[PDB]
Each structure stands twice: as C-alpha cells, then as structure tokens.
Amino acid sequence: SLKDLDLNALFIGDKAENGQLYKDLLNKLVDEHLGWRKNYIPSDPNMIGPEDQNSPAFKKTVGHMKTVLDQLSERIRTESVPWHSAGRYWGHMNSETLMPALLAYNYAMLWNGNNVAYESSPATSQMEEEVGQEFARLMGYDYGWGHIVADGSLANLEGLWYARNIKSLPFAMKEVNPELVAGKSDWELLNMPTKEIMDLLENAGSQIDEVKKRSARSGKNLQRLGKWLVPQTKHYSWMKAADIIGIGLDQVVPVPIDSNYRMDIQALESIIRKYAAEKTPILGVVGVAGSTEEGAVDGIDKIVALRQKLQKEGIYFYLHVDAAYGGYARALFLDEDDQFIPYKNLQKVHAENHVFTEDKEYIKPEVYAAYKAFDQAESITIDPHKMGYVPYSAGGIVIQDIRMRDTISYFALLGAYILEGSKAGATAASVWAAHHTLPLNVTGYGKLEGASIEGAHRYYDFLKNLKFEVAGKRISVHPLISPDFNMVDYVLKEDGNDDLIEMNRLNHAFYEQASYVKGSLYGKEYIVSHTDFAIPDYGDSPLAFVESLGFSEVEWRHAGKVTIIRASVMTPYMNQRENFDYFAPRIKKAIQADLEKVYASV
Amino acid sequence: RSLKDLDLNALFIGDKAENGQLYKDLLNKLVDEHLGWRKNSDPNMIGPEDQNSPAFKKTVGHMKTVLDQLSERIRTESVPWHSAGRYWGHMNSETLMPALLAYNYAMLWNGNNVAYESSPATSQMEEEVGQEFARLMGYDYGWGHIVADGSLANLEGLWYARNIKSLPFAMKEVNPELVAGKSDWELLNMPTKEIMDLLENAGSQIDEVKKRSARSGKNLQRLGKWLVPQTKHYSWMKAADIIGIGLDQVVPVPIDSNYRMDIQALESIIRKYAAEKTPILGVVGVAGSTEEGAVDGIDKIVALRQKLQKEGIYFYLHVDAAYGGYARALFLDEDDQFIPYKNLQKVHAENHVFTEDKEYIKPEVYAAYKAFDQAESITIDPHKMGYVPYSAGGIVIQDIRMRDTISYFLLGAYILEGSKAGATAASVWAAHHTLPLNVTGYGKLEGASIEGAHRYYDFLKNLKFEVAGKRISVHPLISPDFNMVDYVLKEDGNDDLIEMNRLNHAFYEQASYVKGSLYGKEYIVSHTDFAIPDYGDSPLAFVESLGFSEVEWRHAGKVTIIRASVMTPYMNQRENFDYFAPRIKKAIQADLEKVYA
Ligand SMILES: [Mg+2]
C-alpha cells in the first residue's frame, strides 16, 4: 500500500541528483504533446514548412529569440540567491517542489487550457474537480467541495466572501419572503447556524435568485453583519481582506495569542460575549493551523466546543480555518481508506507506514485534537504551493457543504463558483499529479509531511542544549517552544546578560552573518532567517519566554520586541538520523565561527 | 535593430508542431542551465545506492504510472487542436514559444514575486513588465503589474476607483484645511490628479487619511454609480458585489448598433444622476468587446468628461482592454511614440504589419486607442492577445502615486492578490522582449490577426447556398473593429426569427467538435446569443435589416450569432486564406445539407 515509497525519487534533488530523470521524463512528455499536435487529427495542412524554416528571416528570428532567452537565463542565474541545500539551509523558504507536479505543469501548459472555459480544458477541468473532492475528503467533509485558487490570500478572501454573504442571507430571506423566517427576531436571524441558513435557502426554491439579490451582494449595510475575530498575529493580513470585501478594516478584531502563540480561547470567549452583550454579531472566527512564524496550531477543537456552548445562549459564529501552511499535515491522521486514525493508534499506524523513521511522539495531543475538529469548520484554506510541494502559484479553499457555493455563484461549471476568473489548467494538472503520486493520507503525503516534521524535531533537539564560548563569554541557544508542526525558532543569549536590547542586537548581527548578501558566489555552511516578535503584533505572548531567560517585564516593554532566529524545516531530507548527524557538528562549527565574527566587529 | 524582417513563423510550436524540435532544443538548453546551476565537498543526500535500490525504482515506476494517466486524460479527453484555415471559432490556445520556455525555466527556481528575496531577477522582470505596460499605454508617470487574470485586474481597478473617490472626505476628516471651502458635492467630484496632489501634500498624514477612506467600510454607496456598457453589466455585478459597493450600484449604459457604448446615452445617464446629486464612481469603456470585438469611443468619453468638468462633474475612467490592449502596439513607432493617423499606412507598410498597402484600421478605432492615456486605469491580458500562457492578466495605472491608495505594509504591498509566481513574470517578460510593444513586435502579430479577420469578413459577405430546395444566405453582422467576425445564416425571405435562431444553432452543432472527437472537420465555428437583457435593442437595426419585425424581435428575445475570434497569425497571407476559402464554402454547404436532412 505504497509501503516502501521512496521520497528521494520524487524530487530533482538539492544537487540535481535526479536531474537526468527529470530531463528524460520531461522530454518523454514533450514528445507526447508534439506527437499529439502532429498526428491526433491527420490533416492539417502544415502551415509552416522547410521553405519557411530555412529562410534567412526565419533563422534571424530564431537567433533573436535565443538572445532573449539567453539574457533571461543569465539574469536569473546571476541574481539568484544560491540553491538552498538540506543540512546547511535552515531558513523560512523552500524551492524544492515535487517532480511529478513540475512535470505535469510543464506538460499541461503546452495545451494552455483555461479551466473556466471547459472547451479549452476538459481534462484539466475534471482534474480540478477531483482535486476539490480530494481536499474535501482530506478535511473529513462528507458533502463538501473545493477548488484551486490563484494564491492563499485570495483563498482567505473567498472564505470571507462566503461568510459575509451567508451571514446576510436570513435578512435577505426576511425581505423577499417573511414567511421563510417568520417568528424569528433579528438577533436570531444573525445567529443562525450555517447549515440551517443553507437549508432555508434551498427551501426558498424559485425565489433563490431574488434572495441572493437582497443579500450582501447588494451592498446594503455590510457592517450589520458583525465582527471578524482573528488571532492577533493575523490581524494585519486580515485588514486587507476586510477592506477589499467591504466590511471595512475596523470590523477585524484581534484575539490575543498565548505563550504557545495559539489563539487564547478564554480571550476569544470574553470578546465574543462582549459583542453579544451589545447585540453586535460575530461574522466569524478564524483559527490558524500552522502559524506564519511559529508553526503554531490553534485549538480548533476548543473553538468548536466554545461554539456549541454559545449556541445554547443564542450565539453562533462561522468558522474559517486558515490551514494555508498546515493543511496537508492532516494527511498524517488519515489511514489508507481515508479514515481518521484514533490517537492511541497513531504511532502504530505511522510505524507501519514508515511515516517517521523512529517510533516517538511527534504530534502533540492538542495538535491531533485540533486537526480532528477541522470537519466542523465552514471553510478551510490549504495551499498546495506551501506544504503541498506544488510550484507557485497554487492556493486552495475547501467548503464544508457544497451548497455553500450557491451563495456566491454567478451564472448567465467551475467559473460560476469562484471568486477569480480565468485560471490555468496546468495548475490543476500540477496539483492533481502531486495528489495522485502521494495520496492525501498516511500512504502518501503523510510520509512527506512526516519527513519534514521529523527534520524539525531533530533540529529542535540539537538546538536545545547548545552552548558556545566566544572571547570569554558563555553564549546559550534557547529554543522558543517545541514545534506544533515543522517551524523551529530560537534565540542566542549571552549568559548573565539581562539586557534584552543587547540580545536583540546579538541575534540580529548573528542572522546577518548567517545569511547571503547578493552577488554571493560562495554557498555558506549555515543559513538562517529571522523575524521580530513585537508588542503591536504579539501583545505579551512572548513575555513568559523572555522572563524565562531572566528578563524583566520592565525590560520587555523597554525593548518592545524580541528578535527570533527562524526556520521552516520543509526539506524532506533531514528525517534520517545519518543525514542530520552528518551536519550537526558542521552547524555547530558554523555558529561558533559566526559568533566570533559578530564579537570581533566590536 | 528595427526587427524589420521578424518572422512570426519562428515564434510558435505550430499547429502541427512544425517547430517542435526547436522548442525541445531550446528547452533542454534552459533545463541544463538550471540543473548545472544547482550543482555549483558535502555528500549528496540522494546517493547512487539510493537511486539503485528496489524501492527507489518502484517509486519512479509509480511516478511514471501517474504521469501516464495524466497523459491519457489530457490527450484523449480533449477537443482537437485548432487548425488555421479550418478553425473559425472564438478561442485560442497557441502561445509564444519564448513565453513557454521562460516559464519552463523560471519555475525550476520556484520564486515568489511578493518575496523579493525569493525572486530578485523575476521581481525586476515584473517591474520591467509594468513599465512596458505603462509605455504601451502612453502613461509618462504610470505603473502596472501582472494580475492572476483580467477579472481580478478589473476588480483591482474598481478597488482603486472606490478608494480614490473616498479620499477627499477622508482628507476632510483628518485635516479639513486640505480641502477647505469644498462642499460635499465638490469633494465627490474632484479630478483624480487633484486628489493625488492633495494626498501627496498631506505628507505623513497619508496613513491616517487612508484609515478614513473606503478601506474603513464606511459610506461605500455614497461614492456613486459605476457605469458600464450593457454587455458588461453582468460581469461587473460580481466585481461590485465583492468590493462592497453592491451590484445595485452598477448601471448599464446602452450600446449602439456597432455594439459600442452609446455616448449620448452615457451623457444622459450621468446628467440625470448628477442633477440628483448622486456622484458617478466611474465609467468603464471597453476596447475589444467579448462577442463583437467592438472598441468603445474612449476619445468620446474623455471629451465628455472634459465637458462635464466645466459643470462640476467628474468621473474616474477605467478602460477594459483585456482583449484589445496589445493592439495599441499597432499605433506605436519603433521608439514607442504614437503614430500620426496620416502616416499609419506608411509605417505599417515599412514594418510589414499588413501584407497590403491599404486601409485596415478605422479612424474611430485609431481615435479611441489614442485616448487611452487619459484613463486612470487600463486592464490588459497577456493570456489573451499577448499570447502568453494562462494565467497572466494585467493592470496599468495612469499615475504611480495611485498605488499608495491601496497599499499595505515592494511588489506585494501594491496589489490586490498575494503570492505570484516569478515564472509568470519571466513568461511575460520573454514575450515582451521577443516582441516589443510597438509596430516592430506585437504590431506584426496583432496586425496578422486583424488581416485574417478582414479576409474572413470579406469572404463571408458573398455567400449563398442552394440546399434541399431552399436558398440560404450568409449575413455578416458588422465590419470588425478588431479581429472578431460575426454572422448569421438565414433562409431567403423567411421572416421567422425563431427559425433563423434554430438554423444557426443547428449549424453550430454540425460545425463544432465534442470532447473525444477524432474525425477532422473542414470548418469549426463558435456561437452565442445576443439576448435582450444583455444587449437591449442594439441588434434591432440588424434584425430589421434582414426583414424581421420589432414584434418578432421581442417574441424571440434574442438572435443567435455565429462567432469567430481570428487569433491565428497565418490567415493574413492571401495565398493561405485563398486556399481555404473554397474548402470553407464546401463545408458550409455540407453542414447545411445535414441540418436540413
Ligand atoms: Mg504621450
């Protein structure tokens, strides 16, 4: 059952180890396409002949095209920022995509079908429908749907469009046919569960188009529809979506995050109750699976339980899960029949399917619990071009109930149901090929997501007790938290130095040493990324951490931030002990050397 | 240097993959260059012992099985490839070879153009593409970028208009002296340039001003009506829905018998709203309409705006040139300067844009394109008439300062979408650098398309058929503004419009493929209905000219139209078209015989 699937065979390789394989398969596919143009329908005629191809103007034009491509080729290689290789690159980026996804794009692009125009793309249109079904099955939706989006931010925007329109439907039904919602107060109309709204819409029958005309689509009083509650670290990104969708940026309300950088569910409830008390509705809540700088996974199960509790008090909220980064990781929890694996059996199933090379606990109970609850969310974002290992650009959205698409649809198949317009069939081919090489369960993506998580854990373990002596100073590595997923963060700190401004200065100077300045010829032996956790975006979420290092709350406010060394361990190659242990002493040496340069330059 | 003998035949794989080996040779060179770049003392994580292990070989075989399934679907669940001379429908899938090759190569890096660090070369390429767009459109101080598609480019244009309309009031809220003495009506009719100048004068206050703009969600419907040609009414309802003004704020403007926006109607509509003190959020003019290839009189709209400004009325102008945008290259000389009308045929002959020295471009089309530089924003799609592979749309803005009105905190800060592939920028860049956006490059390609359309149009206006005792005529719709050509077949003297609609639908079914078709057809067409809700009475003059009554028009509610968008480059040559002409005629005869059988 794909038991001994070997991930090394599914990538070009950091050193182009499988380059010839890629080239061979690429040429086979291109040959298939060229043969199809030539022979699929004999006649023709050929519009271009040898007499044309051997003319001087033709040959000149080929030379001109070569000059353009050679220029393009040179610019990309000259400006490029040396290829990241496993063991040396421990930063936030990844440029290693699945070979079948690459090949499928290359091949399908030759037909250049547009997936909104079926006639140009019958094959890739069907592939995108299957991808939608595969997303729905991955998320445990029994009657859901999904599609590929131009990118992940547009997928989130589409989720908000869904929430906005759905929230407005009971009022739209009241205006078109009061009998549909007779005996319900306006507050009750604004707190109707989504499935009930959808049932009512379907029940409007002949009147559905008229109801849609009176919904948020009409633009009437969008701020009546309530507040959009998001983790504080996502507040800025959601302001843009709220701005675009017309509810306005003040309708986005930040919810504090905790010391795990997950949404604080006690705070979530307090905020909801505050608005409910003044009869301000909640348009929706966003839970994050795989935060941008910490890989944190919000307690989706706790949010769902909270909603169930509040419904007894007449409060409902739409739930959107942003699993842009963490979506494919749900494949860890589905067996070969796509059934959700009970927690007590997870390590057993993972060993049987060689998901992890060592039998240990990698997935936290609270992470498992969050993933289990995804099937309760109205919508979920999941991006193939993040942890799906599909080339940019490919985002994704999944909806709980296929009927939801009727709330945003425009008529006169696929094009009627989406926010965007024209879209490449090649993208659908690319995602489809990835999904069919690696099924969305433990037999396929479970292994790939597993390899990444295992690499993260090895790196975390390596950092945990790391100590250095530089110019007579003891310097310690302090990992931020044990990873919920595959992102690992840490700070370097001079022992006994309790000046937080100085620690930030250290980690900033360290990052600059362990990174490239453009025009860089030499590849380094250790590259990292970085970010700041600043009060305006993080609140006091990092306070317990900085206090654990010996800093005071007074010190925390004086600095107003903490600088963090960042890794997103997306490479699949660091799961093997042999592979990581080879690099461990070399990383240690690189860090020692970088720290020396830092201290030397003062 | 001037690319005088640039040969379009060398720039495509070809309908029969005539240039297939060239594509492969160039592709392999590029792939080799990337692979060698990755290879530039560490051990390899994928060793030779790994690659020769049984599990590795088994996995490779698994991958090959998947790609074989992919291949079967795409090859066999397909509509046959378009064959020039036989295919006269509304679509095109052929792409410029350098655009394909550039994408193939760049995507190997998997750069993301919102993260410059991830993609410095392709980020520069997208900036250059934006500048190239601005130059094509005559915008001395403008900018642009690639968008996922044209519908999103239109949405972004509306986002701009919406935010910009709201800025005068926003400025009043933050600093009344910026707009002292200005009534609310004056605030709602400030020309965009004045708004941008004031916003620049606001200096560091810009961020607080933006908080009080339409970004706040407040007073969206106060911003006024969005006026679009009737044939775009439905598509703009979706954009207005998304952006929060609401579909109720979209107002259809009647189109004329040339399927161009009626500018007298536009003026009547604007004056009526302005007399009520309802502002106009904006007007959309279309260059290259969806089913007729019509070009609105952008120049007439610009002149109307100037007239109305004297009376305290302003409107934002967005030009939707998704289809017709690259055709502006017909009007730019080798130094990208607009060609005087009297010199157009001379310059076109000097540069082999057209195969004959005669008139091809209507004066009113020339005039419309010349006025583009007065529009606040313009949509243009590389994946339509730029021959770049999907997905690649585009937007151009008149004044770079406009991007400050929609920005969030380079490139990612200034756009509606998020992540965008560096490969997409490479693909557009390679097309633009192979074919400059003037008569030396795209002029030739857009010209070849227009000329094919003209030959087809001339051929259609002399066609009669004797079939099953009946006499059938072809009636072309209108002379093309661009490269779209439409017609109807009709039984002579038959005044039943429902019957004519029946005939044209049945003809289309004979002259089209289905998924899985294998028998080659000598003639393929597309079709659409011009129905009253989208067209109003614009086709009434046409149907009356054929003998149908106005009563008959209302009875049927629509007219069925046989559709062609001549995007092939090969029908510009007389020798080529004249070969297929007798064949098309015989195919129409045969298809009609089947219809009437
Ligand atoms: Mg000028």
Author numbering:
A (entry chain A): 7 to 418, 431 to 620
B (entry chain B): 6 to 45, 49 to 417, 431 to 618
From the paper:
After optimization of the crystallization conditions, the crystals of LbTDC alone and in complex with PLP (apo-LbTDC and holo-LbTDC, respectively) were obtained and the corresponding three-dimensional structures were resolved. Compared with the open conformation of the apo form of the human DDC structure, the structure of apo-LbTDC is in a closed conformation. A comparison of the structure of apo-LbTDC with the structure of holo-LbTDC revealed that there are two opposite conformations of K240 and H241. In the apo-LbTDC structure, the imidazole ring of H241 is anchored by two water molecules and is distant from the PLP binding pocket, and the side chain of K240 is placed in a position near the PLP binding pocket. Residues K240 and H241 form a short flexible loop. Additionally, through a structural alignment with drDDC and pig DDC, a conserved histidine (H192) was also identified, which has been reported to interact with the pyridine ring of PLP. This interesting dynamic change in conformation suggests that K240 and H241 play important roles in establishing the conformation required for the binding and stabilization of cofactor and substrate.
